[PDB]
Design a protein around this ligand. Structure first.
Ligand code: NAG
Length: 251
């Protein structure tokens, strides 16, 4: 009994992409907010209503259905044809509860960025855009076999994770893609540092008082790599679409 959201690359435009992200943001059903920013649910154990299925299909009709966690917006696994694949670190409840009636497989790598790098998929060298998305979908479908190529699945999921999960979390990433939609771009140091700091930013924002002052500054980077520190909500609020509910200071 999960919510579902679709995104087709056929005839896709920067507008269909943005509308898709906002539909996803709604279906993740955040509860409450912190300083006006929607706050994702803290806990949601039941696999039967704690995942949103994103149906990604390309011009050729190839389909990949991605399961996205409603508390973290992270990809835990996906279904292609009559097969399903899960990251090595997907919890047991999710592995058993999702994509029933499929031939199930647990991947030999995790979904974290450093785990994906282990499979040769690096954010710095992975193109993002509508074409990279079409190719990623294609590759996930092509690898719906026993002897699948982990490097292809890893790079394809890296594209999906950033264009869906990270873009849904950050209006900044959403817009880097929105105005480069028909092109191929690779995230710079600013995008990468934002992605890396979603949990820390979420914690400092949620635990701040009415003045929005962070108890501890969060380090981010400009495109060129120059470091800067976020010390207040207002400094980063226009860049965030969803906040993770973080209990204790992450690190
Ligand atoms: C970060 O900035 C450096 C310049 O200091 C640049 O060479 C590098 O490519 C940047 N990294 C990314 C992924 O943008």
């Amino acid at each position: 009994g999960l919510d579902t959201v679709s995104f087709s690359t056929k005839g896709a435009t920067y507008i269909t992409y943005v509308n898709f992200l906002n539909e996803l943001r709604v279906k993740l059903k955040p509860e409450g907010n912190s300083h006006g920013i929607p706050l994702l649910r803290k806990k949601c154990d039941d696999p039967g209503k704690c995942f949103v299925l994103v149906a990604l299909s390309n011009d050729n009709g190839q389909l990949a259905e991605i399961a996205i966690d409603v508390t973290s917006v992270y990809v835990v696994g996906y279904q292609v044809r009559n097969r399903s694949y899960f990251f090595k670190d997907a919890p047991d409840a999710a592995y058993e509860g999702l994509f029933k009636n499929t031939i199930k497989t647990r991947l030999h790598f995790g979904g974290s960025y450093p785990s994906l790098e282990g499979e040769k998929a690096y954010r710095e060298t992975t193109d993002l855009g509508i074409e990279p998305l079409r190719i990623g979908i294609k590759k996930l479908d092509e690898n719906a076999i026993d002897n699948y190529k982990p490097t292809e699945i890893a790079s394809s999921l890296l594209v999906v994770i950033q264009m869906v999960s990270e873009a849904a979390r950050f209006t900044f990433i959403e817009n880097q893609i929105r105005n480069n939609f028909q092109q191929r771009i690779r995230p710079a140091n600013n995008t990468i540092s934002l992605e890396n700091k979603w949990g820390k930013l979420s914690f400092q924002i949620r635990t701040s008082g009415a003045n929005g002052m962070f108890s501890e500054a969060v380090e981010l980077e400009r495109a060129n790599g120059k470091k800067y520190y976020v010390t207040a909500v207002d400094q980063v609020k226009p860049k965030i679409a969803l906040l993770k509910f973080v209990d204790k200071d992450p690190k």
